[PDB]
Structure formats: structure tokens, C-alpha cells
Amino acid sequence: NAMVNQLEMLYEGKAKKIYATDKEDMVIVHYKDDATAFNGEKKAQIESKGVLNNEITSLIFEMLNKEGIKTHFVEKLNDRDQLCKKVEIVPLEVIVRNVAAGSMAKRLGLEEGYELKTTVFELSYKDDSLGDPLINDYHAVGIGATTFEELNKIYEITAKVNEILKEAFKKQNINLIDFKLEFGRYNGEILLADEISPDTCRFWDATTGEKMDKDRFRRDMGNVINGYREVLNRLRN
Template sequence: MDETHGEQYIKTKTNGGVRVEIKDVLVEGTTKKVFTTSNADEVLIEFLDTLPSHLAKKKETVKGKAAINNAISSFLFEYLGSYNIPNHYVKKHDEKSMLAKRLEMLPITFHIWNVAGDDLVERFGFEKYQVLEYPVIEMTLKNEKLNFPFINEYHAYALKISNRSEMDQMTRIATKVNAVLKSYFQRRRLMLGDIRLEFGRAGNAIFLGDEVSPDTFVLYELDDKGRVANPDKFQIKGSKKLDVYQAYYDLFFNK
């Protein structure tokens, strides 16, 4: 890369050798920066070492996390694409960034639970770490000022942030993503505990966006009877957060 991301009109090479200009910061969030490029239909997503708000009450960084999340997201977006799941991934750009289809992101997060984590236990009285017979699908509005309230499809219509066709597409894609990844991990004696998904539109089509990484999903080991075992192994908390990110990385790349 010729210069640091973030300055205007920075020239860099893609993996294919084509010159791409990384231009302005389009969006800067807690865990990623999104840049416009010389291709109006593509953006560059740069991963950051900062922890997301649901994993840290105050700003905290874990050095090395950005590269791990970029590698895992790139792998899983390609894997989901092999199952004809529409997503924004184009290609891995460098250690900490990827090129992606430019989307108009929708301010809705789908949260799918396969195992009853603390939040579900507190709200509904499930047994802690209970493996659910049917996935629980919840939606929240991406609005920090409102404390990310729970919503349903009718809120989305009333707020004019999505329509019935888009909600149907998102629900269908979210359900398929969960099924595909749940199967992938079960073959490795792991359970996809829960996963957060975000979507964007391009024209009339909906695509899976954002990232698919340890910042957005939780895994559990399973015992011989299919019950959750060693539940803390893949929980990103405490003083050894980088070790947990590394454990996730090893699942995919150091088999």
C-alpha cells in the first residue's frame, strides 16, 4: 500500500493488480472504517482493533483483532457465497481490509439464538446454555440514542426503513445463514450459539453486509450428548481476549 488509509486519493493495488483509489471515509464506526473507492460500486472496509459495544462497556482495543476478524469474515463470506447466499464481499484486500459491494445499509440488526445465552435467560427464563429446538430470531433498531430497542417488522414499516419484500428477503437470508453456519460448526463438534447479522440494499436486492466474525457470533463446544460444554472457552471477556480471538482464528486456519 502506498500510503495510510484515510487520506484522500490514496492509490493502492488490489490483488488482481488493478489500481484502485481509496478516497474518503464514508462511515467510521467502532470496529470498522468504510472508504469510498474509484469504483463507485465498491467500498473498502478496514477492520479496527476496537471491541464492539456489546463486548466492552467502555472503549477498549485488542491489538491483532482487526486482522483476525478480516481473515475470518473473508473466509465465511466466501463460504456463504458458495451456498448462493447474497453478500457484499468482493475480495480480501490486505491484512486488515476487504473490498465489498457498496450497499445502502438498513438500520436493523437480526440476532439469531440457537443457545440460550444470558440475555435470553434473563428475559424469558430459559435454562442457561439450553440448546434451543428452534432458533429464536430477534431484531433491534441500530440507534444508540434509543439504546438499540427491539423492533418487529411492523415497526420497520411504520418507521419507513424497510418494506415487506425486503423484510422477507432479510428473514430468508438470515435463516439460511444460520442453518449453513450451524451445520458447518456442528461438523466440528461446535454449536453456533448466537449470531448478529446486518443487511443492505442495492437496487431492489438485499445483501448480507457488515462482517461475520467473532465480534458477531459466539461458539460453544458440545459434549457427546450434544449439550454445551466448556461454555467460557470462546467467550470474549476477561484479560485474555486476544487469546480467544486467536482460538477462533485457529479453528479456521490452523486445523
Template sequence: MARRKKVYEGKAKILYEGPEPGTYVQYFKDDATAFNAEKRETIEGKGVLNNRLSEHFMTGLQSIGVPTHFIRRLNMREQLIRQVEMIPLEVIVRNYAAGSMSKRLGLKEGEALPRPIVEFCLKDDALGDPLVTEEHIAAFGWATQQDMDDMIALALRVNDFLSGMMLGVGIRLIDFKIEIGRVWEDDYARLVVADEISPDSCRLWDVETDRKLDKDVFRHDLGDLADAYSEVARRFGLMPKQSFTSGPKLVH
């Protein structure tokens, strides 16, 4: 079997050259990191769960006309995606105060915001992915003003969809981050949702109990991360309701 060419390796995923031109294979690792990778651990089954959950959310977005890089799932840990030109920004949508926003603004964790707030962070691990303004983005050429307007509109559409989807299974979408890339068609660039949408990139709280079902479980030692992610998968019908001791068994 031919060795695949690795294109990129991040904290949670590896990209390999895809089988067709213009594609990548995205492999989900079991690694969990927090605080800019200062805290690190391997969580058995995490990559399997994130692969399946990201597929579920990406295909849901595509069904309402939101373009994504997702093509199809290949196996338990891998999916085929479109090759895109990544914009070096994280787009964060906040519905409730939590995390860094609570610290920056002195807001109580879980406090509802007056409206969804969109923030941009520069993707740079060495700098800790700092918060940046639209003025910074335009001045340094990371994206045009039109790109930013389109990114905000796209992020708010994702927020509307995910918020409803989560609420339907008893989960509050506190906040989430997405990455966005450009797909070139002749001289026209179309923006698409890329990277992943999973409990790694969202804050998810149980509506009734405020139990955290996201990476904050790992960040703050609140329990078993695989169990929290499995609970999200179960609520969306992607896992059997009973638990298994041999790791996650996803519904195909």
C-alpha cells in the same frame, strides 16, 4: 500517496471510498467495545483476525448462493466490499438462550431453543439498539413486509450454513447478528448480507467445554480475547496451530 476519503467510522470498522465506483474499503480496527461502548479497549491483532474470519464466512456463504457485499480481501486489515443501501436493522438468530434473551425470558444460558428464533433490533447506538417488532418496522417504514420475510429467510439460510460450519470444528453457534443491505439493479432491489460475520457478531461456545470463543470473553473478563479469536481461526485452518507471542500470523 493520496489520502483516502473516510465515509464512515463505527466502533470496530472504518469505511473508505473504494478504488472503483460502487465500492468501499472496509478496515477492521483493533478496538473492542461492549455494553454500548461503555467498556472499551484496544486488543492487538483483533482487526486482523476479524478481517480474515469474515472473509472466510462470507466467501463460504457466496459458495452456496447466499449474496453478500464481500468482493475480496485486500490485505491483513482491509477488504473490498460493494456499496449497499443499509437497512437500519440488526437481524439476530438465536439457537440457544444467552445474553439479553436469557434475562428477558428467564431462560438458563445455553438452553436449547425449540427452533431458531429471529429477532430484529433497530440500529441506534444512542438508544442501545432496542428490540423492535415487525409491526414497528412496517409502521415506521424501516423495511417492507416483503423485505422482512426475505430478511428472515436469508438469516435462516445463514444460520443453517454457519451452524454446520461451526459444528464441524467443535463449536456451537449460540446466536449471531447480521446486517442486511439492498443492492439496486435497475428498479429491482436485491438483499445481501453486509457488515461482517466474526466472533464480534456471534456467540461461539466450544462443544466439549462450553468455553466462550467470542466477545463475551471481553464483556465478562473471561480471559484473553485475541487468544479466543485466534482459536476460532486455528480451527478453520486460518492460523498455524502453534501460538506466537508477536501477534496473530494468518495463513494466506
């Protein structure tokens, strides 16, 4: 039956385009094949990456919606596009680390794979020109990016999302190492928004440690799309 009409492009980011629609409070999120890392210094076109990321995001957000998480996700429209509630993004990346990896393990002198003694929650300030710096709750409130009570709600939702995702991935022999979330305001409510995909998570096979995510691109490991396909195929088991 009736479908939204895609109107003007509102924004093009590193990996997606956001389009207006004929509904003032809805956008279409379009997944590109662009891959980027290292403050824009590293790029590639990874054929079909956007299709896989749209498909994985859609599957995960449908699952989160069913678990009662309030999210922007309405429906997948085609191989690359999904219909979402238009949100005013809170300018914080919310990162969960179950295991220490990447730059974070590096900055603290930890072996990659270090088992953290408590689940890590952290914030990066969403400003690519400042390099998306790590900040704490007081910095975030102090510069007017958020309030204590907004952060409290964000953390509650984030912790629930981690419990749900850790378990869904564990069932399929995937360790959910870390991931990044974004939230936004819609109808005065705090919604989970953006993407949850191998671009925004670290996924290691639980037996071999094999990486099935964007680190295969960041570290020139090859078979990038095969790792993303494997994540989707396991999620669809």
C-alpha cells in the same frame, strides 16, 4: 494486477472504518482493534483483533458466496481490509439465536445455555442512541424501517445462513449459539453485508462450553485474542 484506490473515509464506527474507493459502488472495510460494549461504557484495544476479524469474516463470506448467498464481499485486500460492494444498510440488526444467552436469556429469566424450542429470529432497531431496542416486524414496518416483503426475503436468507454456519461450526466442535447479521440494498438487490466474526457471534466449544468470542472481553475473562485465533484455526482445518 490492477487494484482499487482507497479514497476518503466515509464513516468510522465502533469497530471498522468504511472508505470510499475510485469505484463509486465499492468500499473498503477496515478492521480496527477497538473493542466496545455496554452502550459505549466499556472499551479496550485488543491487539490484532481486527486482523482476526477481517480474516474470519473473509473466510465465512467466501464460503457463503460459494453457497449462493448474495453478499457484499468481493475480496480480502490485506490483513485488516476487505473490498466490498457499497450497500445502503437496512437499519435492522437481524439476530438468530439457536441457544438462549446474554441479555436475552436474562430478560426472560432463562438459564444461559437454555435450549430453545424453535430457532429464534429477532430484530433490533439500529439506533445506538436508543440502545438498539428489540422490535418486532410490525414495529419495523410501522416506523418505515422496512416492508413486509423485504423482511420476508431477509428472513429467508438469514435462515439459510444459519443452516450453513451451524453445520460448518458443528464440524469443528463449535456450537453457534447466536449471531447478528446486517443487510443492505445494492443494485436493487438485498445483500448480506457487514461482518460475521467473534465480535458478532457467540461461539462455545461444543464439549466444554468454553467461550471463543467477544464475551471474553465483555466479561473480563482474559485470553480474548486466543479465543478468536482458535475459531480461525478451526475454520481453516
